[PDB]
Every structure is written in C-alpha cells, then in structure tokens.
Scaffold this active site. Sequence first.
Site, short mmCIF file in Angstrom:
data_model
loop_
_atom_site.label_atom_id
_atom_site.label_comp_id
_atom_site.label_asym_id
_atom_site.label_seq_id
_atom_site.Cartn_x
_atom_site.Cartn_y
_atom_site.Cartn_z
N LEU A 103 0.88 -1.15 0.00
CA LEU A 103 0.00 0.00 0.00
C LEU A 103 0.92 1.21 0.00
O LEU A 103 1.90 1.26 0.76
CB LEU A 103 -0.90 -0.01 1.24
CG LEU A 103 -1.82 1.19 1.49
CD1 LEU A 103 -2.85 1.37 0.37
CD2 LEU A 103 -2.52 1.02 2.84
N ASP A 104 0.62 2.16 -0.87
CA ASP A 104 1.49 3.31 -1.08
C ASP A 104 1.78 4.05 0.23
O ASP A 104 0.87 4.25 1.04
CB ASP A 104 0.87 4.26 -2.10
CG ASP A 104 1.89 5.20 -2.69
OD1 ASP A 104 2.44 4.89 -3.77
OD2 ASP A 104 2.23 6.26 -2.13
N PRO A 105 3.05 4.41 0.45
CA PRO A 105 3.46 5.15 1.65
C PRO A 105 2.56 6.33 2.03
O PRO A 105 2.27 6.47 3.22
CB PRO A 105 4.87 5.63 1.29
CG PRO A 105 5.38 4.60 0.37
CD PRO A 105 4.20 4.13 -0.43
N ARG A 153 -2.33 7.56 -8.84
CA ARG A 153 -1.75 8.86 -9.15
C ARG A 153 -1.85 9.18 -10.65
O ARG A 153 -2.20 10.30 -11.03
CB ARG A 153 -0.28 8.89 -8.74
CG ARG A 153 -0.02 9.22 -7.29
CD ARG A 153 1.47 9.41 -7.04
NE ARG A 153 1.86 9.35 -5.64
CZ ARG A 153 2.08 8.23 -4.96
NH1 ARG A 153 1.93 7.04 -5.54
NH2 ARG A 153 2.47 8.29 -3.70
#
Length: 262
Positions: A39-41, A150
């Site tokens: 999971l993205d930072p 994104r």
Amino acid sequence: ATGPGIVVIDKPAGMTSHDVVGRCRRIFATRRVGHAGTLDPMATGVLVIGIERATKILGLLTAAPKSYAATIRLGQTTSTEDAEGQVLQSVPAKHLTIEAIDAAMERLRGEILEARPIRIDRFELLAARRRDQLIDIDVEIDCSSGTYIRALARDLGDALGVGGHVTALRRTRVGRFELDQARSLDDLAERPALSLSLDEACLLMFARRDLTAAEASAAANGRSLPAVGIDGVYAACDADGRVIALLRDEGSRTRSVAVLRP
C-alpha cells in the site's frame, strides 16, 4: 504465542508497508512476517499481514479486488502527482461542472518488465468542493491494483484540461477485508492478537474438503489425492478441522498449492 494467522492493519500515513511488517515482527515476537501486497506510503488503510506459516497464503490474497477512497485536487499538477510534491502547473478549474467531471471519470473506466493490464472498474464521484480557483473532489475507485491511482488522477486532470493530483488516499478494501476489521498499530501493540488464525482465514476464503486419515497424511507430505471436481483453490482439512494443505483439482488428481501443516 498467537500461532499462525493474518492481521488486518489500518496503515498510518507516510509509513511504508515494509516498516509495518517491521513493527509486526516486534509485536508478535517473530521474524516470519509478510504482507499481501504493498500500500502506497502516502496512503492509509487496509494492509493484510501474515504471521508465521500464514506467509504461505499471502500470494493467494494479492490479486484480490481493491477499493479506495481518494481526494483529487483539480487545477494543479505536482512533481510527485500527490500533495507531497511541489505544484508545477496551476490553472483555474472553476469553469468545470459536475457533469463534465463525472463524464471524464466515466471515460477513464476500463483496462490500462512485462506490461500488466490494470482495470479501473469503478471511478465514482462522491463530493466536490470549491477552493478558490481549484476544485477538490472526493472519489471512490475500484481496481485490480491501486499502483497507478496517481496516474489516474493525472489522466483525469489532463482530460479536463486543468491538471490534477491526489491529496488523500485510503484503501477501504482488499478482497474480503475491509476497514471494520482493520486495527491500528498502537491498538495492536497494546493487545497483540491475530484478526484470524490460519485455519480461520483458509476456511473463510476457500472451498472445503474433509480428508480421511490416509488422505490427510498424503496432503501433509504434498502428495496427490483423487480429485473431486472442486472449482478453485480449496482447504483440505483433517478430522479436527485443522487445515493441512491448500489444494487444486486438476483432472482426476489434486495438486498442492501450499502445505500448511507439514
């Protein structure tokens, strides 16, 4: 001390999935810890952790459908395509309507090293707020993978001619696991416990086959059994309900996917 199993964590913002694994190693006093997919930072929310021999089922959890709640800022692009980067391009979005935004979102649904097909299955508008010259939108995204969310926000901004970037990202679902089953890391440190035991997780996720003592001995060695026409990966259990192995039926014979109690 808990034995093998899975833990659903609500990841805090800024923290890497690697460092969550790190914290869980300390909490559960063991080195055998892994996660079922990054999971993205900058994101928060659902991250599935496996403890002990439950690390062996992590691969079966990684391709699960995901859902995200996101906020996108329309009118600005940033260096990182998120709120952590510097604004690069800035133009008013004030002319945009709900109709225009919603329509551009609908258009971005569909399928987007080896090139992998990423499906944006749902891109739904929840809310829109004016912020002077900009528009912030709250959205919900259903996708096979959130890795390019994104890029999705950038593509939306591009489609509308105003630019866009993500200002908030929260994973609300990984497969069967939603935020209502997720605990914070401080909550977990206070009282270390699994969300589900390995037995519980397999019986929840998969079809089930009860084995005789003879079949159960062969499964514990990873030797094949007669197939019974089960569709997909299944949990092969002993008389006590313990999951010995995960198997797949292939023609007239089984094939071992993972041995859980060798």
